[PDB]
Design a protein around this ligand. Structure first.
Ligand code: NDP
Ligand code: ZMP
Ligand code: ZN
Lengths: 208, 86, 95, 126, 134, 340, 114
């Protein structure tokens, strides 16, 4: 398995497991899961009431010092009752390390804005309002950031279609760019590509 | 102007259809021999309440809920249907 | 071998030609209907049937890695020639 | 406290920005997708799917392409259970119909039954 | 001629030989100006001044439940009892048998490939008939 | 009915409306909005153009791909007309000039070319032909425009008997020569008017009303062989019509009587230009011709078009003529004109 | 059924926020007609605001109407500040669209949609 297989870094796996135990026992009020992936990435799955207590820990604790907010992301998974999964990616420049803090919400629960911890989130979770519909309480300037100004709907939700519900064109009657219902001259051809044969037995779920 | 069809809905297993079942086991054949050209459509189903539909002339339908009746009450309601023709 | 409909419109190698009562001929009014006059179905009939002395022949169309995948063609039927699925070059066992 | 008591029905139709034509006049179909009989594998029959009724696909005048006016046409959502898809349809106001999962029944196979003494299940060849 | 829809062209309740009611789904839409069948009948009733009490497909299925409530419970075979009363009613009129033998209209594979208007309009079924005759 | 021309879709830009239209004169004021309202339904619009193709540029975003077919045509050449109409199922005629040029007169534009288009459309099998006359068309009219347009209405009715001939009164829009014309006599002087402009009555009709009327006449089989009169809802005298024009634009309105024998000498003073003339004596005769009342002809209300009054669209037309000091005032910040 | 609010404890504070938002739109509409130089009357824009408010009038969930107040304040900030243009304000006035078929008979005539 030498040339074509990725080598495994067991030292970083062990170090992130020990730091995950560390974080899970310092903050057991909010930490729900801790898991270390096979390519040695750490995930601290918390409760959405612990955004500000955990992230101010990792921003300030002398064994963490995750001073950089790399990315802030929601993921729509509709089969869960809390369909949105807010993902905080953190970089500790002191310990040369990265951590992932994951939490959850539905459409109607506010997640507390992390602009008091990392100011970088001031646009990112703003984008999460724009793309997913997650409201962030106590955000300084929360509005849309990427969509058009009169845009109804939230694009990166999976119930929102690929082409939207409207399309623009210029109209010389009203001398104005107008929105009409979308009609494609060619429909986006949906390809069913999933093989009926299992590829990975290690990821096999138990049956009902 | 007149009765055109009767539709009797019931369940195979529910107790509210029970007396309705007692109407068909005992008192249906001589009903059919009373009106051999009147369609009396029996429709059994899974979890329906017993119901008596009377379609009249020009598409008018009357609607009698036969829930928890005895067989005598079903007989009286159906003879009211046969004798009304309104 | 391109042919022409009674409207004057040329017929493609598919068999596509607009009807006389079809309004969509108006896109070719004052302009041209671009057809390719080299029909592949006409130009594969010009090829000679390759007489060989083997029972199972192989075709990659020429070029090796410049043609198509190498398929193996059975030549047991003395009634029918053996046609390649890709290139359409047909073969025959000469006995 | 810092929690409120909402006994109301969960309905976010006014928030998702979908127009009314694609809220009230669509029929979501919730179903386990049937196994393609061209294949023997059953991994595509594991999860539930929500699809929609197929609206009008017509022909482009220019190229003959399949033009459409349905935005919800290519939208197939994947759910882990039936009740999750029921909750997701009832959350967005989509009227739906649910097909049950159709599992294959357990067979009683026997290789020796191919060569019985007195039963009709003898194979005529092998 | 009122141009209707096909079975791959409408959502449509069909009942098999065992009483199980099932529904098709709209695979494609009907060609040309042809519409779904009960849509045509309901539009005809709106023109004729005798307007039918439905507007959508689910309301047609509510009327369809009103006439017989098993046509809306899909992939369920509802048990039908009461063979005894139909047997007693069958003994009233002493209808006499004919002298002909029981012969079905389909004896060979030739008589299989064309039964309805769809198979009679086919060229694959026509090649099947031409194959099995020679 | 052919299978490629069956109406499909929901009537959007990329749909098939089943309408194949040859719109003669689509490079003008009515043809702009006509090709607009056709191409948004998903129609095959054939535009025969006489002008530079640059002057047809604004007709290109109005529909989907391949839905506007531009082709050359000459009114003194039946070959190009038959080249244009031979595939259409409706021909619309919008050929017009307010002035007679060096090579064309009012008879070439209104009698010769419309009879040629209607005759060629008859002998090519086109079912529907729409001709656009003027409401004040009359044989004994003082203006040569309205005389030749009445003669052309007669010839189109006799050589294509199933034609829909439409009478607009005086069409206003952004690119008109009616409210823009009334605006632009703050340049020349004090907007002169025959008999103070109070012996003539007008009922101007909005252009999208005329466009919806043309399209609803295309879609109506009962509009075959009719004669429609498209007028706006309110009748105005010319005086307070011009006063409302100058009140929307907030210009100094100071009218004065100019007599009839002297306001045609001003008409010949501006038609000696080789360009598009600023005015002519024919335009003098037609601004000072009252819009006649023809109640026997059907109108916009019989095609389902609700007529838009001037007090909704006059701000849209006449915001362009304002100076900056009163440029942003609103639609309601004006007293309406007096109707009759 | 024990959920977390956004702003409103119940429907009273929620209706208060809807009411204040309609007050702000009603005060804003004359400026929106003026400085976008829209060619509509002020009454017509106020009736469009009343239509956009009555469209959501069937909601009984405090969190959903909290989000509707939030999105209405966002559109109001996009209208007070000139971040919308004339096109974005006139997109509430569906003017280039045809009147869609409403009865069964015309929907039957034009197509297949229920
Ligand atoms: N208010 C009005 O203007 C009213 C007009 N009408 C009628 O409606 C029609 C259209 O009006 P409108 O758009 O305002 O006028 P325009 O002059 O602006 O438009 C005329 C159109 O026809 C073309 N055209 C003009 N003269 C000729 C010619 N000699 N040969 C070939 N093409 C020519 C023009 O294109 P090109 O660039 O080639 O010149 C243009 O596309 C006319 O028939 C007019 O009489 C009726 C009532 C009121
Ligand atoms: C120029 C055009 C500009 C367009 C303006 C767009 C404004 C869009 C904002 C939309 C915001 C809303 O619709 S929130 C309203 C939803 N509220 C509810 O569902 C709660 C019920 N509320 C009501 O019924 C409201 O009418 C009242 C006034 C709060 C209570 O009245 P009822 O009692 O009798
Ligand atoms: Zn080959």
């Amino acid at each position: 398995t030498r040339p074509t297989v990725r080598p495994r870094n067991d030292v970083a796996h062990k170090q992130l497991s020990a730091f995950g135990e560390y974080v899970a026992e310092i903050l057991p009020k909010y930490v729900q899961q801790v898991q270390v992936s096979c390519f040695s990435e750490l995930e601290i799955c918390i409760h959405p009431d612990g955004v500000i207590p955990v992230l101010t820990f990792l921003r300030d604790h002398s064994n963490a010092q995750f001073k950089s907010l790399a990315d802030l992301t929601a993921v729509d998974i509709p089969t869960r009752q809390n369909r949105f999964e807010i993902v905080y990616n953190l970089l500790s420049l002191r310990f040369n390390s990265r951590i992932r803090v994951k939490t959850y919400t539905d459409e109607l629960t506010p997640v507390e804005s992390s602009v008091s911890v990392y100011k970088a989130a001031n646009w990112y979770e703003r984008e999460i309002w724009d793309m997913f519909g997650v409201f962030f309480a106590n955000h300084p300037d929360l509005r849309r950031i990427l969509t058009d100004y009169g845009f109804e709907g939230h694009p990166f939700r999976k119930d929102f279609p690929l082409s939207g519900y409207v399309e623009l064109r210029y109209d010389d009657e009203v001398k104005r760019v107008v929105a009409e219902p979308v009609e494609l001259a060619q429909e986006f051809r949906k390809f069913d590509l999933n093989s009926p044969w299992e590829a990975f037995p290690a990821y096999r779920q138990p049956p009902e | 102007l007149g009765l055109r069809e009767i539709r009797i809905h019931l369940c195979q297993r529910s107790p509210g259809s029970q007396g309705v079942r007692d109407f068909i086991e005992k008192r249906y054949v001589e009903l059919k021999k009373a009106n051999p050209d009147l369609p009396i459509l029996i429709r059994e189903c899974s979890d329906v309440q017993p119901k008596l539909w009377a379609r009249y002339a020009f598409g008018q339908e009357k609607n009698v809920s036969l829930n928890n009746f005895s067989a005598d009450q079903v007989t009286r309601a159906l003879e009211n249907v046969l004798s009304s023709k309104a | 071998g391109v042919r022409t409909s009674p409207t004057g419109e040329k017929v493609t190698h598919t068999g596509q030609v607009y009807d006389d009562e079809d309004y969509r001929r108006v896109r070719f009014v004052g302009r041209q209907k671009e057809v390719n006059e080299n029909f592949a179905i006409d130009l594969i009939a010009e090829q000679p049937v390759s007489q060989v002395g083997s029972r199972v022949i192989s075709c990659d169309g020429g070029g090796g890695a410049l043609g198509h995948p190498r398929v193996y063609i059975n030549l047991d039927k003395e009634t029918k020639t053996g046609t390649c699925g890709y290139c359409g070059l047909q073969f025959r066992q000469q006995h | 406290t810092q929690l409120i008591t909402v006994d109301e029905k969960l309905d976010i139709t006014t928030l998702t920005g979908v127009p009314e034509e694609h809220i009230k006049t669509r029929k979501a179909r919730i179903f386990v997708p049937a196994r393609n009989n061209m294949q023997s594998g059953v991994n595509n029959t594991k999860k539930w799917k929500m699809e929609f009724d197929t609206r009008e696909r017509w022909e482009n005048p220019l190229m003959g392409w399949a033009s459409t006016a349905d935005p919800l046409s290519n939208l197939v959502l994947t759910f882990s259970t039936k009740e999750d898809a029921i909750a997701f349809a009832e959350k967005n106001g989509w009227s739906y119909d649910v097909e049950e999962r159709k599992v294959p029944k357990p067979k009683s196979k026997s290789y020796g039954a191919n060569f019985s003494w007195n039963k009709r299940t003898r194979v005529s060849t092998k | 001629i009122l141009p209707g829809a096909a079975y791959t062209e409408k959502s449509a309740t069909y009942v098999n030989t065992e009483g199980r009611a099932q529904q098709t789904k709209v695979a494609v839409m009907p060609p040309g100006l042809a519409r779904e069948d009960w849509k045509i009948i309901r539009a005809l009733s709106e023109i004729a001044g005798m307007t039918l009490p439905y507007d959508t497909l689910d309301q047609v299925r509510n009327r369809l439940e009103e006439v017989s409530p098993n046509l809306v419970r899909y992939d369920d075979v509802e048990g039908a009892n009461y063979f005894q009363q139909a047997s007693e009613l069958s003994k009233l009129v002493n209808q006499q048998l004919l002298a002909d033998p029981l012969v079905p209209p389909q004896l060979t594979i030739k008589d299989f490939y064309m039964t309805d208007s769809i198979s009679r309009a086919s060229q694959t079924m026509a090649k099947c008939v031409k194959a099995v005759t020679e | 009915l052919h299978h490629a021309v069956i109406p499909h879709g929901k009537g959007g830009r990329s749909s098939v409306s089943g309408i194949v239209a040859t719109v003669f004169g689509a490079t003008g004021f009515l043809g702009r909005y006509l090709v607009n309202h056709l191409g948004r339904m998903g129609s095959q619009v054939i535009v025969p153009y006489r002008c530079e193709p640059y002057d047809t540029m604004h007709l290109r975003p109005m529909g989907d791909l391949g839905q506007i077919i531009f082709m050359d045509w000459n009114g003194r050449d039946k070959d190009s007309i038959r080249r244009a109409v031979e595939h259409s199922n409706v021909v619309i005629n919008l050929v017009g000039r307010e002035w007679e040029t060096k090579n064309f007169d009012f008879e070439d534009v209104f009698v010769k070319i419309p009879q040629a288009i209607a005759q060629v459309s008859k002998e090519a099998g086109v079912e529907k032909f729409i001709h656009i006359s003027h409401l004040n068309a009359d044989i004994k009219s003082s203006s040569k425009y309205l005389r030749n347009k009445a003669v052309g209405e007669k010839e189109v009715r006799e050589t294509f008997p199933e034609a829909t001939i439409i009478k607009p009164a005086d069409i206003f829009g952004r690119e008109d020569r009616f409210l823009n014309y009334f605006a632009n006599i703050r340049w020349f002087g004090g907007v002169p008017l025959i008999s103070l402009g109070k012996k003539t009555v007008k009922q101007p009709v909005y252009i999208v009303d005329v466009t919806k009327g043309i399209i609803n006449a295309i879609k109506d089989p009962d509009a075959r062989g009719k004669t429609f009169a498209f007028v706006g809802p309110n009748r105005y005298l010319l005086f307070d019509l011009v006063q409302y024009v100058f009140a929307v634009a907030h210009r100094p309105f100071l009218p004065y009587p100019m007599p009839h024998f002297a306001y045609r000498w001003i008409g010949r003073l501006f038609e000696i230009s080789p360009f598009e003339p600023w005015t002519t004596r024919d335009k003098v005769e037609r601004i000072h011709t009252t819009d006649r009342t023809l109640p026997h002809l059907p109108g916009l209300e019989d095609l389902g078009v609700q007529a838009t009054p001037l007090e909704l669209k006059a701000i849209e037309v006449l915001r362009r003529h304002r100076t900056y000091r009163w440029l942003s005032s609103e639609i309601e910040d004006v007293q309406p004109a007096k109707t009759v | 059924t024990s959920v977390k609010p956004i702003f409103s404890r119940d429907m009273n504070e929620a209706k208060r926020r809807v009411r204040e938002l309609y007050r702000a739109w009603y005060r804003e509409v004359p400026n929106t007609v003026h400085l976008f130089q829209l060619d509509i009357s002020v009454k017509q824009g106020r009736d469009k605001v009343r239509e956009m408010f009555k469209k959501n009038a069937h909601v009984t969930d405090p969190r959903v109407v909290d989000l509707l107040v939030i999105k209405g304040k966002m559109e109001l900030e996009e209208t007070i500040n000139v971040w919308k243009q004339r096109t974005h304000v006139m997109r509430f006035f569906h003017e280039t669209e045809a009147p869609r078929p409403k009865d069964f008979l015309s929907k039957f005539y034009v197509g297949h949609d229920p």
